[PDB]
Amino acid sequence: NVFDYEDIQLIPAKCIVNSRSECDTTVTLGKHKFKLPVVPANMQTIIDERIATYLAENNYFYIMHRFQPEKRISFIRDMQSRGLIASISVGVKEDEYEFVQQLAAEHLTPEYITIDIAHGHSNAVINMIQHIKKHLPESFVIAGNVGTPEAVRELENAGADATKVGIGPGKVCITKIKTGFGTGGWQLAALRWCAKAASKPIIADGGIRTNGDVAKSIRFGATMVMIGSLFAGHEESPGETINVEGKKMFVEHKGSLEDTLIEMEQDLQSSISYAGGTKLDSIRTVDYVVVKNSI
Amino acid sequence: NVFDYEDIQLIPAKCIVNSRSECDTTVTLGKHKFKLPVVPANMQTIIDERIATYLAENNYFYIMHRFQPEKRISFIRDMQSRGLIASISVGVKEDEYEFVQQLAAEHLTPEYITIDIAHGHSNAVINMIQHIKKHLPESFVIAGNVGTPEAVRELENAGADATKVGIGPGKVCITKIKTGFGTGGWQLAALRWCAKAASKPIIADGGIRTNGDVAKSIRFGATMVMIGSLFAGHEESPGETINVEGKKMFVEHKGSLEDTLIEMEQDLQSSISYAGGTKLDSIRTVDYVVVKNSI
């Protein structure tokens, strides 16, 4: 009964809008509303401070990476002084306990904290959730990564306000190849399985290959969809651009992040049109089929 | 229980003809009889006025595109004055309401009108059917595109004389990739599903890769099969031809449309031979299997 993104087709329902433009693609996560149910991967190869500022300035969700952890206290302070959301990443080591205590003492509370660990179903993650909720009670805590309903439950019960689902979701990623474990090759069914157990929002993390996979993630129960590859290789992205005969970034060149986000929004409005609704939640009650040949 | 064209093999029955030439490939749609149960895609990259005249002059069904909508009233008038069928396309916008009223006033009635919309299960399409049937009662109305039995039913009930079935049927088309919705990758099973509900003729639209897929569409309940790629890239087709070392059209060169239609007819006679009959409907009662590896 297991499948992935490429195996699913959603079934259209009666169209009730006269134009895509009528369809509302917004979503709320905790106390804030955002333009789209998508978020760039919280990695230094995908996001940086300039991209995060663009995103927050235009009401798109972001989560900053923790590659330069010494910069996070200033990052928070600065975003919040421009009236922008501060959304950061933390780990679970002893120095991250101090970091959090530090924040509590300057009375900085980031709107969002993501605990970002490969194998996030652990007491290390559980204790960090409990520590964060003690010292920064107003922070919205996203915990992961997990791959099972028992894990989602345990993390929600520890106090997480959301969980991030995906354990080496790519079909040929390192985790899958080297360990034999994870959601690689069945990420969509894994998401469904985890979502059926969840009382709190889920961020679906990875395995996204097309804009249609965003609608599919919403059907099987995501609130936010975390995306790597589709956001990689924009002019704004980390790295260098390579007439000539067509650019490459570090593998091809996708142009402007802004155009990509607009197209994502348009494609998602089309999805809502086909779902027979006018808003994002309409995607959640469409029927679907599992196709025979998907590759 | 879902599959597509490549997964199906039809099972032969006792041959009762001494020659393919004995097999009748004709079909009727409304008040007219045609040579073959196939029709070119109603798009400007596939059909034009010269091709439509060839087709009507030789008793092949066609449906003209609406890319130059201002030419349709003259097109109708001219075909009908040469004793040829006029088969046109319309949309659902306010100006198409006027267009239809225009026709009613010059007492032009095209034999066939196709309402051609991407997501055709809509009140926009339902109201256009009702408008057409009021002002041009003698016009044979084909409505689409749809992908479900509830849609076929609703459109038939609104007054359509046929429906066109297929929602981004190609395995790697835009609709599938960008929205996650439609019949892409299971077009044959979608056709079967829709056909079981239908009281009126169905035009099966797209996913056709081989001439054998025409017989397969007939088995699972099509009356006409709408074809794009197989008709693309003929000398007569829109675009330009490119010794040398073998032509290309815009991707390869298939030669003469007339030879393609002859071969389609011969291949279809072979299908009837294998079906144990002498006419097209014999294909409808053959057994079939769903193969394991189809790619």
Next chain:
Amino acid sequence: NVFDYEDIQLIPAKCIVNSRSECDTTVTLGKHKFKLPVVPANMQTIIDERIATYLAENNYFYIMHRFQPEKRISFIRDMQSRGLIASISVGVKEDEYEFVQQLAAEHLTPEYITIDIAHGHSNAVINMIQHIKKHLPESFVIAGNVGTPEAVRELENAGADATKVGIGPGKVCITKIKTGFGTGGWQLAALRWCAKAASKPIIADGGIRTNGDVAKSIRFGATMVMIGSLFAGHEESPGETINVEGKKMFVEHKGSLEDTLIEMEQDLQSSISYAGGTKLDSIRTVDYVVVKNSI
């Protein structure tokens, strides 16, 4: 429940021989015994008179093609005068009725006659069987091609001494692509299905890609296996050979037919070894599995 050659693995049983050389690969068809349960395709691109003489001289089964039908009466006479089996092909047209009568009058009786028609489940084939059995009662009659158990039954009941099973068996052959009918992509399961109904020997025709597919055909109930591609492109084969940097025939070059037949025999002895027997029929009672990914 349908599959093909690539989906099947046969399961080994306790080995009871000390050497492959102990295993007997012979088979009987009618009144004669042959070295191997394989036979080249009866086509002019695969067999000719020199190859047929080699085969008969060494107790391998052959069936000559009918591309030069005027030569068949002399071919029979000449083989039989060298004490060799005469095995020919016939069609079902009125002149083939005369041909047969001709034979009856010179009291030439070929040991084997193959009625070779694409869609062999027909009254044309049934009447030719009955005609042959009237005028040449001692001839062993192989009739085909068929693809169903009802067809095998009808042909056996008409008087055939064997049937040939396969209707466009190749995964990308003409019949499959152009008509949508036949055993293409499920030839092994088709063979099994037909074999369960049969009271007389079956020749399994086509879809053979490896020497292991010969054992597989035997398991699912063949007596002789007709092979095209594996016998194509030998030095002895029709066509022309193309240092240099390695030969081609018309697509690569396989060397000597004799070496190919020796290797086929050795590979088949290995199959019998793995089947836990010492003779060909041991392959018929092994267990098997249907694998998940076969391509």
Next chain:
Amino acid sequence: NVFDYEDIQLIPAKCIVNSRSECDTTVTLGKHKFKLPVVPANMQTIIDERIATYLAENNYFYIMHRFQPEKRISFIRDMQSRGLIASISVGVKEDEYEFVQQLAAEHLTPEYITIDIAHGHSNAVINMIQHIKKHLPESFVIAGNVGTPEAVRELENAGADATKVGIGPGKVCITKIKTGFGTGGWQLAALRWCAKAASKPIIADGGIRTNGDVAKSIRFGATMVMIGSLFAGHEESPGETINVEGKKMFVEHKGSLEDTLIEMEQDLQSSISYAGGTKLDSIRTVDYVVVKNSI
């Protein structure tokens, strides 16, 4: 119900270690403990005397090949005099009966003897087990190769201390292609099937493509995993190395065997981490899924 390595994903359990370094990857086979549950293929293209000495000196299991059988008595004597395990291969021919008797007479007892035959379910193998156990009772006897639970049972019952499972396990190996028999294309399910019957340790032989397949073999019941390709093409391996623009060995160049074994150990510690344990046996009780598209 049949599958292979590529179809399986193991499901993570709650992580209980603070570091991979906490996880114990050791295994015992008979009277000795080794670093890893892996062993190089006992073939001259993979192992030699220098590699065997490295392995034994560092507490990795090895099994020497028998390509130069005249060297085995000296090999044993020499290893054992350096305080190293002697692990050799034997066949089942009459001269191997003498070889064994020879050993018994110089009172050389190798710690490990592997009876290495393609089709090892045979009385030839059964009698060699019984001969070995009579003349060298202290030798740990591994018998194979087998592919069924009845074979494992018969060999265990004859006196084998372990069995080696795999009959042409590779997807495109000779045995599969030429005979139609064996575990090729379903090696993991074959291992599971055989393991459920076994009272003694199993060595899983072949079909390993990734380090994650080691954990998968452990889940479905291996004690040691025999590996060919992943160990082929190291600087230390048999053959010759080919700036320049990147080395090849005989197909690419993998560098140092020592680095490969370290990485294998690290990857396997990660597997134990994901399995929710601290030792190898934790992998044995994880849940798993069978994915839809695996290629």
